[PDB]
């Protein structure tokens, strides 16, 4: 209990397509973060952190849910 950083080091404040997303991850304020952070698996291989502060994020993410649900 000394110093803990949020899961998302930074957020990718740049629009891109939902086509690349296969897995979604949402972590609510934890013992390391006093807020909320959206995370996503990047089909390139890595992971990526999105900022719910952007409208395009609420959209590409919304489509993922509507797509994984309709599937």
């Amino acid at each position: 209990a000394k110093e803990l950083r949020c899961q998302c080091i930074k957020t990718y404040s740049k629009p891109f397509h939902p086509k690349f997303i296969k897995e979604l991850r949402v972590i609510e304020s934890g013992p390391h973060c006093a807020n909320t952070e959206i995370i996503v698996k990047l089909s390139d291989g890595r992971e990526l952190c999105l900022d719910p502060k952007e409208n395009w994020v609420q959209r590409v993410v919304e489509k993922f849910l509507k797509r994984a649900e309709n599937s």
């Binding site: 899961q7 998302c8 080091i9 930074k10 957020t11 990718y12 740049k14 891109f16 397509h17 086509k19 690349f20 991850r25 972590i27 952070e37 995370i39 990047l42 089909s43 390139d44 291989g45 890595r46 992971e47 990526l48 952190c49």
Partner: peptide
């Protein structure tokens, strides 16, 4: 890298 389309990050410090 080829996963993209002419596009995800061209930078990477987003590793939770």
């Amino acid at each position: 890298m080829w996963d993209f389309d002419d596009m995800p990050p061209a930078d990477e410090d987003y590793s939770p």
